Enzyme design. Structure first.
Site, mmCIF file in Angstrom:
data_model
loop_
_atom_site.group_PDB
_atom_site.id
_atom_site.type_symbol
_atom_site.label_atom_id
_atom_site.label_comp_id
_atom_site.label_asym_id
_atom_site.label_seq_id
_atom_site.Cartn_x
_atom_site.Cartn_y
_atom_site.Cartn_z
ATOM 1 N N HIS A 214 -33.269 -97.992 -30.555
ATOM 2 C CA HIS A 214 -32.336 -99.395 -30.388
ATOM 3 C C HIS A 214 -33.333 -100.237 -29.472
ATOM 4 O O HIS A 214 -34.157 -101.476 -30.011
ATOM 5 C CB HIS A 214 -31.486 -99.646 -30.559
ATOM 6 C CG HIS A 214 -30.826 -99.120 -31.413
ATOM 7 N ND1 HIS A 214 -30.267 -99.478 -32.825
ATOM 8 C CD2 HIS A 214 -29.885 -98.280 -31.439
ATOM 9 C CE1 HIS A 214 -29.718 -98.565 -33.461
ATOM 10 N NE2 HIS A 214 -28.889 -97.327 -32.848
ATOM 11 N N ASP B 79 -29.350 -106.895 -33.371
ATOM 12 C CA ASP B 79 -29.169 -105.070 -33.139
ATOM 13 C C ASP B 79 -27.979 -104.878 -34.138
ATOM 14 O O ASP B 79 -27.210 -105.274 -34.034
ATOM 15 C CB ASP B 79 -28.941 -104.963 -31.259
ATOM 16 C CG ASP B 79 -28.884 -103.076 -32.034
ATOM 17 O OD1 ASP B 79 -30.298 -102.576 -32.779
ATOM 18 O OD2 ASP B 79 -28.470 -102.569 -31.183
#
Ligand SMILES: O=c1ccn([C@@H]2O[C@H](COP(=O)(O)OP(=O)(O)O)[C@@H](O)[C@H]2O)c(=O)[nH]1
Ligand SMILES: O=c1ccn([C@@H]2O[C@H](COP(=O)(O)OP(=O)(O)O)[C@@H](O)[C@H]2O)c(=O)[nH]1
Lengths: 453, 453
Positions: free
Chosen positions: A15, A112
């Site tokens: 990520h 995110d």
């Protein structure tokens, strides 16, 4: 008028990697950038990456999101990355004052995906245009969005049926992440809630370009606007940074003394580590394949805890037997710079969308060997492009062992599969023409900055 | 808000380098930067550096200024750099449509010192705050400003008196650019017309810091405000870019196996090329000294024309004899990274201000050997700083030959000179503290952006 955008990071290099690459993109598109970091990170790779970004981009501001004291005793997983993500999620009310102190005023909060559910109200109460940074494929995104309805429609979990995905080919539950089968897992609940939360966004960012999906995007988008759904914003492929290119490494030196297209690159991301037996069989298969190879090895999930040698794994004479055929390393390497090398002919990967898109950008054929999570989904996407191939008979890597003979015999097919290369060229050119002036990603991203304004 | 600044470049690497580094710093200070280039560049290194800068900084927009067809038959010089600059200056009436098409609207037009006289009428016509990018010394700026008065005072050129300079030490005509002593010369008229037009600017950007001038700059500045003159804006040291440090270069590897502070760096910039007899005598002196050395060589002025080897000049059995003692190279190197290396003790320099400031920033003692131009001025400025030293007996390089014995004996002195070392440390620290937050150049630069606004 240089818009100010803030980024909300979680944990996990998978990520973390596209985040900074997107930040660098905004910086290189006349926007002011503030990243919201959280220490201590699970892995050193994250910290070093952040430090490198801030070193090469001094005009990027770093704000440390101090988290709540976390009690791991109430999380039903031992994976430190999921744990860290949860630790960030359970202090969502604390990001708000942190978001307030930011000067100049923000124009967009890009969160995110794994953190969206917890942090999309925070952006809502601050009247900030929230954006989902999706670190995986588009089909996987529609999967995460359709999954809650799927688990809702079932009394309890469930053969190998099919969950209907709008716009894309249906998904067999064999492709659905194994840990999301039991509904009590932290990652399962997170996946469900986030997937529910994506529709509360002003737009979803996906590391991809319209020519890769199959030109199926612009229809899906205005087919979503009719439902009042956030648009799939194609901003990829997200280019690697200017500090990810160290022309004087040790694997590179070796790569320069090999013929072109004759070296097979093997790396299963940064999160995952194969079993001992699978590693031995992998080495056997590598030697059997009769091709050159660059092999990146991990024996523990966190790189901060992987301190055993292959002398303690494979043995001494085994490793001494394999290193003469190619290059074996149990360290961090620069996948981008390696896949860009003229010598590399193919990529044996896990199917992680970052490595995948890095291969697409550098035009390198792939042998997708899934291990867990979204990978299998990606494995179809890639295969529908014509850039890669994957053996469905191998199934999940965590679930099934593959013996060396098959490995070598399939690698031999990878190095001889020419349509994959002919497709690799055209796809690399399409990917490059997608980010240039008047491309898909360029027009999309410019349309994004234009609304900020 | 992000102030859109434009930059206008000319010929020469010594002019191009600070333009680029300054544009980089501006970009790193939230200012939208456009650079105005002209092709083909005289030397290749210009093109390469431009491409490197644009590659690392895709946000820096490039605008090509298509010059007029140029007849060099009416100029009185064969120097390609001067001819290039002139070729630019004669097309001054074309930068207006070029500037008009710039989006978004501009906040400032930074112009080069050798291009000001021609192009400040443009900015004024568009009401743009014009700025002089001065690539040389502050005292040199005062000299270029005071010069036309001094030449107007004389009936005809002229012993070795002194031409006064307000705020700095006086300047003998033995330390004035020997080509400016004749008044018909294109560079002389350029010098005069440029030093006259500096006053119309809203400021004069200079690559220096106040602690280097001996803290004599503010007193000059408020004595300039009283005379209705633009301020000497010190924004140095203009830090080297990220693409100037290639850790895996050919000579850095050599330096890596040399004892620290034991190696003599020897270079005379890009533009200049020594004679044949002086190259031979220099090769003699480098051996005669007794110190290790890294000697960069140019036989022609333009790199794009120097294909001949040193075997042709020096000889086979002479060059082969010299390479045994120290690293010899007739190619473009990375000067900043070399000076940055631990193994470097000093610097035999010509006196160019870029080289000088790099040696200051990395804190390396200097043996200034003025060859031409503004290098005696800068030889004094540096000698008074306590960092370098320059023998006056050698005079100009283009006028007097220095034999090997003297070169070696003086290099020995350069290496054995401790005060220059201590002052190197202290000066490098004072150089670093100036660009840090609260430093001279930080407050200056921030004030400049603030006015834009
Ligand atoms: O030895 C390694 C292993 C990983 N990577 C980087 O890690 C990323 C892989 O992330 P992905 O999401 O595709 O896989 P994950 O490990 O997260 O499942 C790629 O961008 C690589 O550049 C690397 O540089 N060197
Ligand atoms: O072999 C060389 C010679 C020159 N330079 C660069 O050229 C500049 C020297 O310019 P200066 O104005 O000091 O000298 P001149 O313009 O008179 O040649 C320095 O910044 C160096 O980085 C270099 O990198 N390698």
């Amino acid at each position: 008028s240089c818009p100010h955008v803030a980024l909300l990071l979680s944990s996990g290099m998978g990520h973390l990697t596209p985040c900074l690459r997107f930040a660098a993109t905004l910086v290189q598109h006349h926007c002011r950038v503030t990243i919201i970091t959280n220490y201590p990170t699970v892995s050193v790779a994250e910290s070093r990456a952040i430090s490198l970004l801030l070193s090469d981009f001094p005009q990027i501001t770093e704000k440390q999101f101090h988290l709540l004291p976390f009690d791991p005793s109430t999380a039903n997983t031992t994976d430190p990355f999921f744990l860290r993500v949860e630790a960030i999620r359970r202090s969502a009310h604390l990001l708000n004052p942190l978001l307030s102190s930011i000067s100049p005023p923000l124009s967009a909060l890009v969160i995110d995906s794994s953190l969206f559910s917890s942090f999309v109200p925070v952006a809502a109460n601050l009247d900030l245009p929230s954006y989902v940074l999706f670190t995986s494929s588009t089909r996987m995104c529609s999967l995460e969005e359709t999954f809650p309805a799927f688990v809702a429609s079932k009394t309890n979990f469930q053969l190998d049926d099919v969950i209907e995905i709008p716009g894309f080919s249906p998904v067999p539950v064999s492709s659905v992440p194994p840990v999301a089968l039991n509904l009590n897992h932290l990652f399962t609940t997170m996946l469900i809630q986030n997937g529910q939360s994506f529709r509360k966004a002003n737009g979803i960012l996906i590391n991809t370009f319209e020519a890769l999906e199959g030109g199926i995007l612009p229809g899906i988008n205005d087919k979503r606007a009719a439902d009042g759904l956030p648009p799939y914003c194609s901003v990829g492929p997200l280019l690697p940074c200017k500090f990810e290119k160290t022309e004087c490494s040790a694997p590179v030196k070796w790569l320069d003394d090999q013929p072109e297209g004759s070296v097979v690159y093997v790396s299963f991301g940064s999160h995952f580590a194969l079993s001992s037996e699978q590693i031995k069989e992998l080495g056997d298969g590598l030697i059997r394949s009769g091709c050159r190879f660059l092999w990146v090895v991990k024996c523990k999930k966190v790189d901060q805890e992987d301190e055993e040698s292959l002398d303690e794994l494979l043995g001494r004479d085994v490793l001494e037997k394999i290193k003469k055929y190619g290059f074996v390393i149990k360290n961090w390497v620069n996948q981008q710079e390696i896949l860009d090398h003229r010598a590399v002919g193919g990529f044996v990967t896990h199917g992680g969308w970052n490595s995948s898109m890095e291969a697409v950008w550098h035009g390198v054929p792939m042998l997708v060997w899934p291990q867990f999570g979204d990978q299998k989904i990606n494995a179809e996407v890639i295969e529908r492009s014509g850039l890669g191939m994957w053996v469905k008979r191998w199934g999940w890597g965590t679930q099934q062992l593959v013996k060396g003979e098959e490995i070598g015999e399939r690698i031999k097919d990878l190095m001889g599969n020419n349509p994959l290369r002919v497709r690799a060229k055209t796809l690399r050119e399409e990917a490059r023409k997608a980010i240039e002036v008047g491309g898909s990603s360029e027009k999309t991203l410019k349309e994004l900055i234009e609304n900020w304004k």
